[PDB]
Symmetry: D3
Subunit: 329 residues, 6 copies
C-alpha cells in the first residue's frame, strides 16, 4: 500500500496511563506500566498507523510528562504541530486490568489538567483545519473544562466554513456529566456532524433515542431514526457482549445509504480492551476516506477494533494488511 | 459501609511464597515473585479487608523474612500483636502457576519452621481470645509439628470457656498425614467447632463421612449427616469443577437451620487460585458475624472466593461493594 | 511504649528505574513518602508507637499509602479519609553531574483541602511524648496553618515536646511568606532541624562561609539566642555530585556544637535522608543520649538512609550503632 | 524411572529467540525475553529431559551468543560435544506471541549464520554417529545454506552404514523454498528415513501426496499411502485445529504395523506453542526407543506436546511422570 | 528553524540489564542508535529541524527505529525503506576493571546495501544549514563511499557547512584503508571531530605525549595546516575504568586551543558521549558561540550524556548551560 | 583435558534487585552458588574438565542447580541425588556504609545429610589432577568430616594435588571447633588458600599489623614452617565500604612472597571473589605459571569477578590476561 497525504485532525485530551502489571491491583503493586492515551488521541494514532497525516490537537504542560506524551504520539506517526504547551499538569488515569469476573477499574486523576484549563485563544482553528479532509471529536471532551465546549464550537464552525467532514464518537460517561447536561450540549453540535459513532447507551443517553430489543432489525431501526433526525451520512455502532473481563463478543454495524451492514462477530480473549472503540472510529474514518464500500467498511473496522483488544496500551500497532487478513476470514 | 471493631482471631502458619513469573517453571526462571501467605493468615487478611479487627496468631523468626511476613500482614490491616518471635527459619513454598493441562505445582520447604517448633508457652490464649467474637483454625496446622495439636487444644478450651465462636476449615492434605491420623486428631476437635468449612474430600477423609453422587441433593444429605453427628450451627462447602488449570467452575453451599443454600456457579479464567478456599471461609465468617441471611451468606461468599481467583497472591484485595456487585448478578 | 506523632502529607512517588529519565521510561517504580511520614517511619522502625496524621482519599492509592505506613509499623488510626486524590511526585534519580529532578503533582490533594474539624488534637496528642512537623506543610492548603496551630496549642497544653524541620521550599512559597507563618510557630518549638538555606529564608538569620565549624556553631547560637531552642540539629551535605557526597551533622545543645564523623557516600537514594536525621535526633532525645552520641547516631542513621531505595529507612538500632561505633 | 545411556543425535540450527514480554509487539517494547531454540535442538532437549544421551550437532560462532546457546543446551542436559565452532554470527528470530485473533508473528534474521555457511568438513559423521541408536533431522535444514543438503546426505549415508534409525520431521516452510525444490531435495532423502513425522500440509507439499477430507479414515489412508511408497516403519502426524492464537485443539496419530492410533484430543489455552511439534517428535522417538506399544506412543506423545504448549520457550521442561499423568486421563 | 542533516546507520542495540554478561542474561534491554543518528537526536533535542538520512527494512524493527527517532523529535522523511534486515549490536555495559564489550551483527543491513538512487541529495540538502557524517559509514557497504560523495558534492554546491567525525574503527577497516577514502573527503569538511587515535590512523598525523595541552594544541594546528578546517574538536577521555573517567574537550579555532573544564564521571552509559560532543559543537557553531563557550557547552553536554541510559541524549539547553556555568 | 574435582554444598541464592532490602522486595533474583561450586565453575570456564561433587534433592531446585553448573561447563556426573531440600541463602547486596547481609537457610539440606556411601571416591578421583575443598563443608553435617577424610585418603593414594580454602565461618563453628577437624586435614593439603582471619582461628597462628607486606610474608612462612605447604595464597581486601574496595593478593612459594598489583574496585557483586582467586591459583599451578605471574593472574581474575553479578565468573583466559598485563 501507499502513504496518503490526507490531513486529518482530532481534538481532545491525552493522559498518562498507569497500570499495574500482570493483573495486579493498585494496592499490591511495586510498579506501574506507563503509556499515554485518550479517545481522540487513539483515533489519531490509528489514522497515522494507516499512513495518513494525522494531527492531534491538545494542550500539554511543559514538563517531562507532556514531552513524553508528545513523543509517544510522534513515535506512532501522529504530527504534534498543533499541540499547545502550557498549564500545570498532565491528566492521569490509573487502570487495573481485570480478569474473568473482576472488571477493569479506572481511577481518574485528570482534573485541573492543562487541556481542562485551555482557553479559546490557545488554538488557531483556521490554521489547524487548513487543508483538512476530516475532523474528529468525542463527547468525553466538552465536560472536561470550562472553555472546552466553546473551543469545540470554534473548531466546528471553521470545519463547516471549510467543508471539512466531521465525525463525533458520542462516548457518554456518567462520571463526567448527567444525560441531561450531555443532551443540552451535544444535541446542538449534531448540526455540524456528518458521521456518528456510538453504542446503544450513548444514543439513549446523549440523543434521547431508543428502541425495544437491544437483534439486527432493532439496531437498523435506531440508525434510521438518528439518520432522519440529524441527516448523518454514516452511522457506525459498536456491539459488545461483555461475557467477562476476559471474553467478549464483538461486532459492528455501519449504516449508510439507508442500509445497515453488520460485520462478522468475534469472540475475543482480551489482552487490553482500552482503545477498541477508538480504533473502530479510526477504521471507520479511514474507510470513508478511502471510499470503501459499506460492507467493507464494517468488516475492516470490526477487524481492526477486534485486533486492538489484543494489543497492550491505548494505541493500535497495526498494518492495513493485518486487518484485511482478519476481515477476509 | 463502616469499620466494625469485632475481634477475630486465626492461628496457623504463614510462609514465604516464591513463584516464577509468567507461567515459567522453577527450572527455567532467573527470578521469583515474592509474597507471604497461609490458610489461616489468608482468612485473617480477608476479615481485615472487610473492616473487622483480625489478629493472626503465629510464630516467626527474628530475621528479615519474618519481619516482611509481619509487615505484609499489617499492610492488609491484620493486627500482629500476638505473633510470637523466635526460632530459626520461616517456612517457604515454591509455586509454579499452571496453565491449561499443566497443573500448578508446589514444592514445600516448611519443615523446621519457627511455628512448627513452637511451644505451648509461646501463646497466652487467655490474653489472645479476650473479647474475641470468633476463632478460626484449619486442619493443615495440627500435623505441622510436635506441640501444635496441644497448642490448638489449649486455644479451643479457652475459646469454649469464653463462649467464642469457633470455625474449622478441614483442609485435608495427604502430604501432611494419613486419613487415619487426621481422623484420630480432628474428630475430637469437632466437639469445640460450631461452623465447618470443607469440600467433599475433606469430609470423606477427615470425618469418614460419604454419600453417592458427588448433585445438590447429595451435598445437602452430606451436610445433614455431619450436622447430626457434630451439631454444627453452619456447614459451608466449596464446589470446584477443575476443567483445567486455566478454567474452573466454582460455587458453594451454605447449610444452616436444616437447609441447604446453593450460590450461583461461576466459570472462572483463573489468574491465581491460591487462597480461594480461604476467602470463602473469610467470607462465611464475615457473613455470620454480620447476620446475613443464609442465602446471602452463600452468594456473598461464592462471589468473594470467585473474585480471589482473579487476584495475584494469597490474600484478597477486595471491598464489600465489589463482592456485593458480583453477587447481585 | 512511647507515643510519638507526626503530621503532614504523604505522596505517591513515581520514579523511573535504572537512572532513566521520565521521557524515556515505560514504567515507574512505586513507593509512598513524605517528610513527616518518613520521620514516623523512622521512629516506628526504632520501636516507638509512631502515629502519622494526615488525610487521604478513599481510593486504592490512599489505601496503598496507608498500607505502606502500616507495613513499616506506623499507626494509621488518625488518618482522616476523604477528598478527591492523593498527591504525587515524579523523581528522576540522577547520576554524577546530572542532578535528580522532581516534578510535583500534589495540588488539590485530600490533605491540601483538609479542614480543622478533620483532626481531634486532644485525642491524637493524648499520651504523646513528642510531636514533629515540617515547613513543607503550611503552604500546601488554606487551612493547614490553622490546623498546625490547633495541634501546637494542644501540644503546649499537654506539655508535649515539639520538633520542627524548617524545610524551606521555594516552589511552595517565598522567603517572605515562610517568615510570616513559621516565626509565630517557633514559640512552641523545642527542637529545630534545619540547614543553612532554611535558616536564612525562614528565620532571617545569615552567617559567612557555609556553602567550617565555627561558622556553623555561630549560626546555631544566634538561632538559639533568638528563639531559645533546647536543641539545634543541622545536616551538612557536601554535594560533589548526584553519585558521591560527603555527609555529616551538627547537634547544638547546652550552648555547644557537636559535629559527627564525616561519611563519603556513594548514593543509592538520598530522598528521606534529612528526615531520618530528624527521626534519629528525636529518638536520641527520648532515649537520653548525650549530645555527641546524639550527633553520631543521627549521622550514621541518615548516612544509612542514602543506601536504601525509597523514602523510608529499613533499619534496626543495632545496624545504626554498628556504623556509629567506627 | 532410570537414565538410559542410549545415544541419540539431531542436527540443524539453533537460533537466538527474542520475544517481547506480555503480548507486546516489537514496535512497542523496551525489552526482549531471551532464549535459544530450533526444531532439531528442541528434539534433543526433549530426549535429554527424558534421560537419554542426546547430542545436538550444529555450528555456532565463537562469540557470547554462541556460548550462551551452547550453555542453554547443556543446562537442559543436551551434550554439546559435536558442536562445531566458527563463522560470523548466530541466527536470530524475533517472535511476537499472539492472542486471540492476532496471530503470532515471526521476523527471521537467520541468513549468513555460522551453520548456514557450514562446510562438509566441519562434521565427522563417523565419530558423531558411532554408537548412536537414533538420528533425527527436519526439512527446515537443507534449504538454510549451500552445503547443508550435502552435509545431511553425508550424515544419512553413515547412519545407513551403521544401521542407525533415522527420523525426519518434514517441516515444510514456504519462506525457505518452493514445494517443487522441497520435493526435489526431500524425496531422495526418504530412502534413508525409517520414521516420518509430519502434518497434512507437509505431506501434500513435500511428498506430493494428498486425500479428500482433511476425519480419522482420511488420515489413516494418507499414512498407508506414504507407508506403501516409502516403506516407513512409523508415521506420526500432528493434528492442530487453530481456533485462535489463544485456543487450539490438539491430537496426534501414530501409524505402525498397518494401523492407525489416535490420541486423546486436548483443548489448550496456549502459553507458548513454539516447539510443540518438536516435542511430539521427541516423544515419538522416545517411545520408539522404549518399545512403547503403538497406542501408548500416541497418547504419550500427544500428552507431551500438549504440555509443551504450556511452557514458555522452545524446549520442554517435563518429567516422564508428568506426561504419563496427563496421558492417563 | 534551521534544517540540519546527518547520514549513517542506525542499529537495534541489545544490552543485558544490571551489568550482566550476554552469557548470563534472560533478557536484553532494547534501544536504537548509531553515531550520526545520535547527533541528529542531539540537534533535535536542542530544537533544530534535524533530519536523519538512512535506509531501514520494512519490518517492525525498521518501524521501531524510525519511531524512536521521531519520539526524540528527529524527522524521518528521508529514510529510504527496503532491504532485508536491520543491523544489530549487543552491548555488555562494563564495570570497574571489566570494559564494556560490543558484539557487532550489522553485516547485510538495508543501509549496507543501499544504492545511490535511494537518496535524492538535491531535495535532502535543500535549505540545509549543516550536514554531518562519520567515518563509520563508508566501510559499511559497497556504494556508501559513492553515496557520501554524492551528498558532499551537493553540500558543496549549496554552500552547506560540513562536519565529519573520523571515528576510525579497526573492525571495519585498516588504517591504510581509511586513508584512501577519507582524505579525499576532507576537501569538503569544514569542522573536524576526532581523537588522538583517529587522527593517527585516518589522517597520518602523530605527536608525542597524548595517551598535556601543548601536545593536543600541536596536533590540531598540524591537522589545520594540512586540511584547513574552520574548527577542530577533540574529546579527551582519561579512562581509569568502566565506572569512573575524567572527561574534557578541546575546541581549536582561530588558530588557538580552548580546553574545557574537566569532569570526573561515574558513568551510567557512555555510549553516544562522543556523538553528543559533536552535536553540541554543531549547535554551538550555528548559534555563534565564542570558542571557549563552545568547548564548555560541548563538554557539559557530553558529560551529561554519560548519565543517561541509551545512545541518545534526553537534555534541554537550560540543563547543559546549568552544568557549564559551574 | 585435565580432570579437576571440587566438593561441597551448592545453594539457591535469593537476592533482592537494585540494592533493595529483603523487607522491601516483591521479588528475588535467582542464582545458584557455593564456595567449591564456584571454584569448579572457574576451572570449567578456563577449559578444564571440572567436576563438582555434592548431593541435591530430586526436585526442581536441585534440577536447576545442576543445570546452572552444566551451563557453565561443569560436569555433574558425580552429583548424588536424594534428600529433602536444597540449602538457601538470601543476600542483600549492600552499598556504601551499609554492608551486604546474608540470611542462611541451609540446615537439613540433602548435602548436610549425605552419607559416606553416597560418594565413590576411587571412581570420582580416578585420573584427577586436582582436588579442592573448603572449611565451610565439614561443619555442615554429621558425616561430612568423614566424607572429606574418605576423599582425602584416596587423593593421597592416587597422588592427586590438594588445595583447601580455610574459609572459617563463625555461624557454623567455633574457633576451637575448626581446629580439631582441619589441622588433621592439613596432612593432605598441598596448597593453602586463606585470609588473616582464617589463619588465626583455624590454624592458631597470629601476627601483628594485618587489619603491610612483611607481616603477610611472616604469617605465610610461619604457616609453611608448621604444615609444609607448596603454596600459600592470601587475598588482601581493604574494605573502605560495600561499594569501593582495594584488592590484591599474595602468593607465597619457594619461601618467598609475591604481591600482585592493587586494584581499586567499584563493586557489582563481590560474592565468589575469593573462590575465583582459588580457581585462578589452581589453574596457574596446573599451567606452570611462575609465582609472580600466578599472583597477577589470580588477582586479575578475582578483581574481575567483583564486576560480574552472581557467584560464578563468566570469563575467558584472554580477558584475565588483558587486565593482568596493565
Ligand atoms: Ca489492501
Ligand atoms: Ca452493602
Ligand atoms: Ca520497561
Ligand atoms: Ca509479565
Ligand atoms: Ca513410568
Ligand atoms: Ca535494575
Ligand atoms: Ca530475567
Ligand atoms: Ca517488583
Ligand atoms: Ni503529508
Ligand atoms: Ni510510548
Ligand atoms: Ni478495634
Ligand atoms: Ni506484601
Ligand atoms: Ni510499600
Ligand atoms: Ni557536649
Ligand atoms: Ni551416557
Ligand atoms: Ni537458557
Ligand atoms: Ni478461554
Ligand atoms: Ni525508543
Ligand atoms: Ni579564543
Ligand atoms: Ni543459571
Ligand atoms: Ni566512586
Ligand atoms: Ni619468585
Amino acid at each position: 500500500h501507499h502513504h496518503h497525504h490526507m490531513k486529518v485532525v482530532t481534538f481532545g485530551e491525552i493522559m498518562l496511563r498507569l497500570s499495574p502489571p500482570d493483573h495486579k491491583r493498585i494496592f499490591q503493586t511495586d510498579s506501574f506500566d506507563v503509556t499515554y492515551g485518550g479517545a481522540e488521541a487513539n483515533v489519531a494514532a490509528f489514522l497515522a498507523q494507516m499512513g495518513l497525516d494525522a494531527y492531534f490537537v491538545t494542550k500539554l504542560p511543559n514538563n517531562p510528562l507532556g514531552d513524553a506524551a508528545a513523543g509517544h504520539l510522534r513515535k506512532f506517526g501522529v504530527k504534534t504541530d498543533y499541540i499547545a504547551r502550557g498549564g500545570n499538569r498532565i491528566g492521569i488515569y490509573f487502570l487495573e486490568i481485570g480478569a474473568s469476573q473482576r472488571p477493569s477499574k479506572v481511577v481518574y486523576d485528570r482534573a485541573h489538567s492543562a487541556i481542562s484549563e485551555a482557553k479559546r485563544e490557545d488554538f488557531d482553528w483556521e490554521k489547524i483545519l487548513d487543508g483538512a479532509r476530516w475532523f474528529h471529536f468525542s463527547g468525553i471532551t466538552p465536560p472536561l473544562g470550562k472553555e472546552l465546549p466553546l473551543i469545540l464550537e470554534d473548531a466546528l464552525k471553521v470545519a463547516n466554513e471549510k467543508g471539512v467532514t466531521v465525525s463525533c464518537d458520542l462516548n457518554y460517561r456518567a462520571r463526567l456529566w448527567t444525560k441531561e447536561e450531555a443532551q443540552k450540549v451535544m444535541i446542538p453540535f449534531m448540526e455540524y456532524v456528518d458521521v456518528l459513532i456510538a453504542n446503544e447507551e450513548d444514543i439513549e443517553k446523549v440523543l434521547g433515542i431508543s428502541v425495544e430489543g437491544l437483534n439486527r432489525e432493532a439496531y437498523a431501526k435506531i440508525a434510521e431514526e438518528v439518520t432522519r433526525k440529524y441527516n448523518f451520512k454514516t452511522v457506525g455502532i459498536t456491539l459488545r457482549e461483555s461475557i467477562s473481563a476476559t471474553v467478549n463478543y464483538w461486532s459492528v454495524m455501519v449504516f449508510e445509504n439507508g442500509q445497515p451492514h453488520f460485520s462478522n462477530r468475534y469472540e475475543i480473549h482480551i489482552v487490553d480492551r482500552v482503545g477498541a472503540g477508538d480504533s473502530f472510529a479510526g477504521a471507520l474514518i479511514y474507510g470513508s476516506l478511502m471510499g470503501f464500500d459499506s460492507q467493507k467498511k464494517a468488516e475492516f473496522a470490526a477487524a481492526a477494533s477486534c485486533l486492538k483488544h489484543t494489543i497492550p496500551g491505548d494505541f493500535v500497532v497495526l498494518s492495513i494488511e493485518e486487518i484485511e487478513k482478519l476481515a477476509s476470514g
